[PDB]
Design a protein around this nucleic acid. Structure first.
Ligand code: MG
Ligand code: MG
Ligand code: MG
Ligand code: MG
Ligand code: MG
Ligand code: MG
Ligand code: MG
Ligand code: MG
Length: 1306
RNA sequence: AUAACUCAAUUUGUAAAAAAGUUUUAGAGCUAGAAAUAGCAAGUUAAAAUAAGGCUAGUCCGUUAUCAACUUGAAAAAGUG
DNA sequence: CAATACCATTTTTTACAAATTGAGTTAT
DNA sequence: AAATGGTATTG
């Protein structure tokens, strides 16, 4: 009887029900409630609308940040508990004053000066120590006994802001010997190159290298002090290495292979090992010198002070910042006095200007302040202040955005210094030095997670003992090993074939043997003599493995031929059938280990298999080297200490697909052979793992054969689309219920298809490329949003097809070409797009860029690939012409993929639907598919609309969502009716190329009468009518023109953050929300703008006047998210606390956002809040006006446009009727009318597009601004909810077919 | 359509960390002059909170998912035209 | 009252697993 | 990254 059409989107699910003749039924539905209507007729077409589903990301960030805050607090508490007793003797209430420092004097228990308790001592303190860093340095360097409170302040300041943990081990600053070290590097280099020596030259290496410029700049200056020495040269590269940069050494050493070294990267020792093996170890001392120079210079950006003077170079550098700020401030003030005293007031007094006053007291940033005074500085006569400005070193504060560079090791250094200094005077500091250091030091390992005790959904850590966990007892109380193990294993896949078995490490030796053999097994070969291509035998395979795979990292086909087939079988020439260029599989771990253990015979020994598998397992499972070592301790007797040291560092990540038991555990009953045995040797049939697993003769297969919401949430994809999936399932259920619990014949489903990342991509790709184009043409992140500019930079300001430069001022003349033409592949991304001055230079139009273009441009594309400026996909598409380009079969494939859905998520949807609809099995125990789920791509219905002029304009209303579903149902049912053999492609469940091409390219022709075709379209085998050109189109037009369509906005309780996060200053307003229980916002300030979880109808009585008369009230109260739980626990008490009395509890109506209300003339409003409403109506514009608008915005149709210009006036008339009846924004409507009146002279096209603009005035939901032409219309908002309180509440089903209407008269 | 491998791009989810920002308080402003109001002097730092808070009391948890109305359920969801 | 203009926490690092897309080899 | 509901201020 009926089929269902569905359109699944991120914010919408369109739905429709059709009959055998493509009609949508109209049914009478019962209306519940206290209203007049007992029923309403509804057409069975509509669309569900809903706010986007959100990722769990923001929540994760908030949660983790929370944990950070509490843990920092705990650090401070530990510190205070250590200091407690000895502080009690010095100061009774010090810590108390510290914790109540936020309180106003009126609220304080103790006196207002935190540190010392009186004015004189406090002022004295601040006079002696203007910044905390002054106190830090003094406490580090001095020898005098210090006040315990000052000591605490220093220690606490270092602990509260400890710095990062990105560098392992410890640092011990030594800026002292940079000159001697640089001279030493130059020395050893000159030794190694006796022929040509570099002159030390009195080059102030210290100044240039520790200067506050970027690494690269300092390099340039350094080699600028060097004659005949280029930055790309050997020594230049070495200097770059010492600077913490990543240089490449291959061009210096004639190496074909890349040799890039970065001292910070953990692979440095090994990369350098390989380089030295390639070039000779007489170059080792050179790199040693580079490293030695690197250590003394490592933290030059941070320290800025000679390490001789102090043991606190950081705090000293901060003190420097302070002093320079001071001096330059005195100077600047003096200057402005002398030369521009008129602007002095704006600079040093006005907080709102971005001056120095706005800088210090206002919310102006260092950048904004700098930008403010740049012109002031340069216009005056000041020359050095600009230098400081360009250095970003003008008037610096100590607490800045760029202090994230600071590693915890330096704060640790100062901490330890202070501790050593004052432990001489305070014994408890001596006894507790290690604890305190460990407070700053300790960090919960990421592989351990939250230190929970059975109440954290997120935690996995296991306890070695039942103590409360502290930083000092962590190793003893927490089972770190089992915790890391859990960290990885709670996420890792189990073998699907053997669900109880863990998957092997990807770099497992066994797994790679399995992969290499699984690949080798299907390799065939032919020679001149033999009569057919032959498999490799067991013997031959072991030969190839032992000789090639166990000697060469990768094994090429050429190596197979020459090194095996030629050398061992005396074949001068041979053909290979199973492998391409080189074997994909490789025994990489075998060679890694071989480099480490140095004992091939140990590896080849079968008895060491378990041990090796355990070692690789340990290497994969853990990455904490300290634990890896402990894991390997058993095998310490097997190899030397150096070998163990090397084995620690070898680390693997990733897990395979299969288990050890599958590969080498299960044995075939008849054979007694494992899978791997069959891969090694299977005689005549060289059977695959796939074959092995499905072979009825073998016993492997049989040995193996041993909630909707959860299911949807478990799928892979955006949560936004998952929301749509759940919604569409529920819609289907309700539709089936509507149709008397009869299942549909068919269900047709369709599914819908920055700047910082771009700037990063370009910066890296260019730096790697070595291009100056960023320096020549500076960009900003928001400029790259332009496609042509982004491309331009991705191609290094070059033509992609022609090997010539492009112009940044001529992009409008240039073309964006699709690499594989749009007709075949609907790809709009950068992976398929290219900037060239003209697309003709691509070559042919019907294909991949031509062979000439490939030949001429290939290497450039290689460079772009290596700089990551183009991906591999893009490259391989660019270069396809040297593989014959696009084959006709590929063309056909692209065409059928244009209309046949391959997306996995949609297949999941189709499967969910199919499994819900078909639940019965026949007498043969096979599924009875009563309902056919059909999946269509958007192109079918889009093309159908264009061809037969069923035009779509999204902005008019939300009806198009439903219309698309209707057309989906129609077109789908028609398609399967006409071509039942196509069931395999479009329906869920279980020469020629040109033919396929034409076929799929012309599949939708049966709808047309002339392209000639009969008026009636029927299916040959059954003769059943599929289409009737004489009436079915008319029916479609009737359906699309149907005025009433069930568009339902999903009512939703608002969730998430309580309010805006901003912490506002104190203000006299009841809107201000306390940040803490005792913190009155009139005194302390706080939060603002809370989010309404849901409104609530209250009818009750409230006091009025001094005498507290009981007046009667009916009103909407917004229950905020923060208030929610309290309101649910006991609503009566909550409402009574709000000031309501005699609350009629039974009349309480929960009103979530988007609640629907009908009023006077069909006029509707949706609940936006407790104090604002949204538009609740859909403007049903006649199809003539929609089609006319489509044609006018974008020859017979042109003359149709010119013939029907009166349609504009009729459309605006429609809009006006609508607005006056429903929108009620007279002023805005008058501005619309006026604006249209002024622009009647303008071209019809423009006027039409701008008429399209006019519809947001009439659109459903939140009011929004729009421009008619140059006239901007501000939104008319609905700032009151009074009328709704006497309106009619409409409770809607998911389809909106069932309604309960409540006349809110009470 | 499925399975393993290779190369790459992407998406989702989790953990451990860092630097700012903000808000109050503390950094005795000063001479004049009744008084606003002038003139100058100043400014870089710190403490504390950073979802209100919760019981399960852990160096744990608090912003995702899910939600018509009536009847039933704890809850999912069911039962109703 | 309701017309109106302004506002909205930001940024960084490390470690990890799973899908999926889509170009290839081999198979059910 | 909008955009759209809160807020103070004005009209
Ligand atoms: Mg659609
Ligand atoms: Mg807290
Ligand atoms: Mg600050
Ligand atoms: Mg290959
Ligand atoms: Mg590992
Ligand atoms: Mg939610
Ligand atoms: Mg701060
Ligand atoms: Mg509803």
């Amino acid at each position: 009887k009926y089929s269902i059409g569905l359109d699944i989107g991120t914010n919408s699910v369109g739905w429709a029900v059709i009959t055998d003749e493509y009609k949508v039924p109209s049914k009478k539905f019962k209306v519940l409630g206290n209203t007049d209507r007992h029923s309403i007729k509804k057409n069975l077409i509509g669309a569900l609308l809903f706010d986007s589903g959100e990722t769990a990301e923001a929540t994760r960030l908030k949660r983790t940040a929370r944990r950070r805050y509490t843990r920092r607090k705990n650090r401070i508490c530990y510190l205070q508990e250590i200091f407690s007793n000895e502080m009690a003797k010095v100061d009774d209430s010090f810590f108390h004053r510290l914790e109540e420092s936020f309180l106003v004097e009126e609220d304080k228990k103790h006196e207002r000066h935190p540190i010392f308790g009186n004015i004189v001592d406090e002022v004295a303190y601040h006079e002696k120590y203007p910044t905390i860093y002054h106190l830090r340095k003094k406490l580090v360097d001095s020898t005098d006994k210090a006040d315990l409170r000052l000591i605490y302040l220093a220690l606490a300041h270092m602990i509260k802001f400890r710095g990062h943990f990105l560098i392992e081990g410890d640092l011990n600053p030594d800026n002292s010997d940079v000159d001697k070290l640089f001279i030493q590097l130059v020395q050893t280099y000159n030794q190694l190159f006796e022929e040509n020596p570099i002159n030390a030259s009195g080059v102030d290496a210290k100044a240039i290298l520790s200067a506050r410029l970027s690494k690269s700049r300092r390099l340039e200056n350094l080699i600028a002090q060097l004659p005949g020495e280029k930055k790309n040269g050997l020594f230049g590269n070495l200097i770059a290495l010492s600077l913490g940069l990543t240089p490449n050494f291959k061009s210096n050493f004639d190496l074909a292979e890349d040799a890039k070294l970065q001292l910070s990267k953990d692979t440095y020792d090994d990369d350098l090992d390989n380089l030295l093996a390639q070039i000779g170890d007489q170059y080792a001392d050179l790199f040693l010198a580079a490293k030695n120079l690197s250590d003394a210079i490592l933290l030059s950006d941070i320290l800025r002070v000679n390490t001789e003077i102090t043991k606190a170079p950081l705090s000293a550098s901060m003190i420097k910042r302070y002093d320079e700020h001071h001096q330059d401030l005195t100077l600047l003030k003096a200057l402005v006095r002398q030369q521009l005293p008129e602007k002095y007031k704006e600079i040093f007094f006005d907080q709102s200007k971005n001056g120095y006053a706005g800088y210090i007291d206002g919310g102006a940033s260092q950048e904004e302040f700098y930008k403010f005074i740049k012109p002031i500085l340069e216009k005056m006569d000041t020359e050095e202040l600009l230098v400081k400005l360009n250095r970003e070193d003008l008037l610096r504060k100590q607490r800045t955005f760029d202090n994230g560079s600071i590693p915890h090791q330096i704060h640790l250094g100062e901490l330890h210094a202070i501790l050593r200094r004052q432990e001489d005077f305070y014994p408890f500091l001596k006894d507790n030095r290690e604890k305190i250091e460990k407070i700053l030091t300790f960090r919960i390992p990421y592989y351990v997670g939250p230190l929970a005790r059975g109440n954290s959904r997120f935690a996995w850590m296991t306890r070695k003992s039942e103590e409360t966990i502290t930083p000092w007892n962590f190793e003893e109380v927490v089972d770190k090993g089992a915790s890391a193990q859990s960290f990885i294993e709670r996420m890792t896949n189990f073998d699907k074939n053997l669900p109880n078995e863990k998957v092997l490490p990807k770099h497992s030796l066994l797994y790679e043997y399995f992969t290499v053999y699984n690949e080798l097994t299907k390799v065939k070969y032919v020679t001149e003599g033999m009569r057919k291509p032959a498999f490799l035998s067991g013997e031959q395979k072991k030969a190839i493995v032992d000789l090639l795979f166990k000697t060469n990292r990768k094994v090429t086909v050429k190596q197979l031929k020459e090194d095996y087939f030629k050398k061992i079988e005396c074949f001068d020439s041979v053909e290979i059938s199973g492998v391409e260029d080189r074997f994909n599989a490789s025994l990489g771990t075998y060679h890694d280990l071989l480099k480490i253990i140095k004992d091939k015979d140990f590896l080849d020994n079968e008895e060491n298999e378990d041990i090796l598998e355990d070692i690789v397992l340990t290497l994969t499972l853990f990455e904490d080297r300290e634990m890896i070592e402990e894991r390997l301790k058993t095998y310490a007797h097997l190899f030397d200490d150096k070998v163990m040291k090397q084995l620690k560092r070898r680390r693997y990540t990733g897990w395979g697909r299969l288990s050890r038991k599958l590969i080498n555990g299960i044995r075939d009953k008849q054979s007694g052979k494992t899978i791997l045995d069959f891969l090694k040797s299977d005689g005549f049939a060289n059977r695959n793992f796939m074959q092995l697993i499905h072979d009825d003769s073998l016993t492997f297969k049989e040995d193996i054969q041993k909630s909707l919401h959860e299911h949807i949430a478990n799928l892979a994809g955006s949560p936004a689309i998952k929301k749509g999936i759940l919604q569409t399932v529920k819609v289907v259920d309700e539709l089936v219920k509507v149709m008397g619990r009869h299942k549909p014949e068919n269900i047709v489903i369709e599914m819908a298809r920055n700047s910082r990342e771009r700037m990063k991509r370009i910066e890296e790709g260019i730096k790697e490329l070595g291009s100056q184009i960023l320096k020549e043409h500076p960009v900003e992140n928001t400029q790259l949003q332009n496609e042509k500019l982004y491309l331009y930079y991705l191609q290094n300001g070059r033509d992609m097809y022609v090997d010539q430069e492009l112009d940044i001022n001529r992009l409008s003349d240039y073309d964006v070409d699709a690499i594989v033409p749009q007709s075949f592949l609907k790809d709009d991304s950068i992976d398929n797009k290219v900037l060239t001055r003209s697309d003709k230079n691509r070559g042919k139009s019907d294909n991949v860029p031509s062979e000439e273009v490939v030949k001429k441009m290939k290497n450039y594309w290689r460079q772009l690939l290596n700089a990551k400026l183009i991906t591999q996909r893009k490259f391989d598409n660019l270069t396809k012409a040297e593989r014959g380009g696009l084959s006709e079969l590929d063309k056909a494939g692209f065409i059928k993929r244009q209309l046949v859905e391959t997306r996995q998520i949609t297949k999941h949807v189709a499967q969910i639907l199919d499994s819900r609809m078909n639940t019965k099995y026949d007498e043969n125990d096979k599924l009875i598919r009563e309902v056919k789920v059909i999946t269509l791509k958007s192109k079918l219905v889009s093309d159908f609309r264009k061809d037969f002029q069923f035009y779509k304009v999204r902005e008019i209303n939300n009806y198009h969502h439903a219309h698309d579903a209707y057309l989906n149902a129609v077109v789908g049912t028609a398609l399967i009716k006409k071509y039942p053999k196509l069931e395999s492609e479009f329906v869920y469940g279980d020469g020629k190329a040109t033919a396929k091409y034409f076929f799929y390219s012309n599949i939708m022709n049966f709808f047309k009468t002339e392209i000639k075709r009969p008026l009636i379209e029927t299916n040959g085998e059954t003769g059943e009518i599929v289409w009737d050109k004489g009436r079915d189109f008319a029916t479609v037009r009737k359906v699309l023109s149907m005025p009433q369509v069930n568009i339902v906005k999903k009512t939703e309780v608002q969730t998430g953050g309580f309010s805006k996060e901003s912490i506002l200053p104190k203000r006299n307003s009841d809107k201000l929300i306390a940040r803490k229980k005792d913190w009155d916002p009139k005194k302390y300030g706080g939060f603002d703008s809370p989010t309404v979880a849901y409104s609530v109808l209250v009818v009750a009585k409230v006091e009025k006047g001094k005498s507290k008369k009981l007046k009667s009230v009916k009103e909407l109260l917004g229950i905020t998210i923060m208030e929610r739980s309290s309101f649910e626990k006991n609503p009566i008490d909550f409402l009574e606390a709000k000031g309501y009395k005699e609350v009629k509890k039974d009349l309480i109506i929960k009103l979530p956002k988007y609640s629907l209300f009908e009023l006077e003339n069909g006029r509707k409003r949706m609940l936006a809040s407790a104090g604002e409403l949204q538009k609740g109506n859909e403007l049903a514009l006649p199809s003539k006006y929609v089609n006319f608008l489509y044609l006018a915005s974008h020859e017979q149709k042109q003359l149709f446009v010119e013939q029907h210009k009166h349609y504009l006036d009729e459309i605006i008339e429609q809009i006006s009727e609508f607005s006056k009846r429903v929108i009620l924004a007279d002023a805005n409507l008058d501005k619309v009318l006026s604006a249209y009146n002024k622009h009647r002279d303008k071209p019809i096209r423009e006027q039409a597009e701008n008429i399209i603009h006019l519809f947001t005035l009439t659109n459903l939901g939140a009011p929004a601004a729009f421009k008619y032409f140059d006239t901007t219309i501000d939104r008319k908002r609905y700032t009151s909810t009074k009328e709704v309180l006497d309106a009619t509440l409409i409770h809607q089903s998911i389809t909106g077919l069932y309604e309960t209407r409540i006349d809110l008269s009470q």
